[PDB]
Amino acid sequence: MILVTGALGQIGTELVLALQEKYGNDKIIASDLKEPENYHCKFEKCDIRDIETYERINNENKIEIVYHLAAILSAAGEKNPELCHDVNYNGLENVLKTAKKYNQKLFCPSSIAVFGPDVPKEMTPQNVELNPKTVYGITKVKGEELCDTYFKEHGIDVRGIRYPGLISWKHKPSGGTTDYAVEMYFDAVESGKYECFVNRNTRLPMMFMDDAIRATLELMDAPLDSLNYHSNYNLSSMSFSAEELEKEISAHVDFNCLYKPDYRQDIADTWPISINDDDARKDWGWEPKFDISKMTEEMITNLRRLNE
């Protein structure tokens, strides 16, 4: 029995379906703040900070494995730092405390946001000092440390990935900083114009959702004794600037992109351009399959369909 928190967000939208297909619909429970409709999966509403309800859901459904995706993201968290700490840190602590009680296995993702400007910007190593300059990054570092304490001190099998910016078409993201890449696709197809909230040179690690979902499932399936890292694997696929994405998209559809930076520039400026993920590659056989042009094909084909 598997529970997915944050089930209705960008990752959860695709992860729930992937898990239902791998394990059976009889095995999957979804959860988020507000009940949706026309929803195929079994669903239980819960605020991640409400420990009594969270625990009830886990024991009533006999949850043995939790994929914990509930969070406030970088840009929303910069504007509301108190809420970002509360949901991200106290929410995770709730998940980990419950995992200890019920002897659960966990997937608790981190982020490239753990890194700050003091470390190498290209091919950032696994083990560098973590000095993030965002509220959200700070919560992710504290979360990595808390997760690794539950593994070492309490024997909880908790695994996680420092995801790069994730690009998908099934669910448009809306509180982050890497969001411009998805927004640029949606707006290019829907209206042939986009106003980008970072400058044209902003260069960040990116990954297509298929790859991110597959990595998550592969890492969860690995034998525990093959892993040299737990909460916080580096993971890599692509790196490009905003104008480089604009150009890739322009080879498929007419659009004009205007660049109008806001506060989210300050967030992105503090992050790396690319990530060394050799440990994932070595420990559990990670390789990405989607480069920029394959990703672009998938995005445009599916967005054109959805706009017919």
Ligand SMILES: NC(=O)c1ccc[n+]([C@@H]2O[C@H](COP(=O)([O-])OP(=O)(O)OC[C@H]3O[C@@H](n4cnc5c(N)ncnc54)[C@H](O)[C@@H]3O)[C@@H](O)[C@H]2O)c1
């Ligand atoms: N590019 C990316 O998408 C990316 C990159 C790196 C890390 N991550 C991490 O992956 C995880 C999922 O990210 P996502 O992009 O799918 O985010 P998302 O914001 O799309 O989804 C998160 C979900 O958490 C829910 N949530 C918010 N506050 C809550 C609360 N108090 N209680 C219960 N649920 C609450 C929201 O309703 C939302 O559906 C997060 O841990 C995030 O930090 C994502």
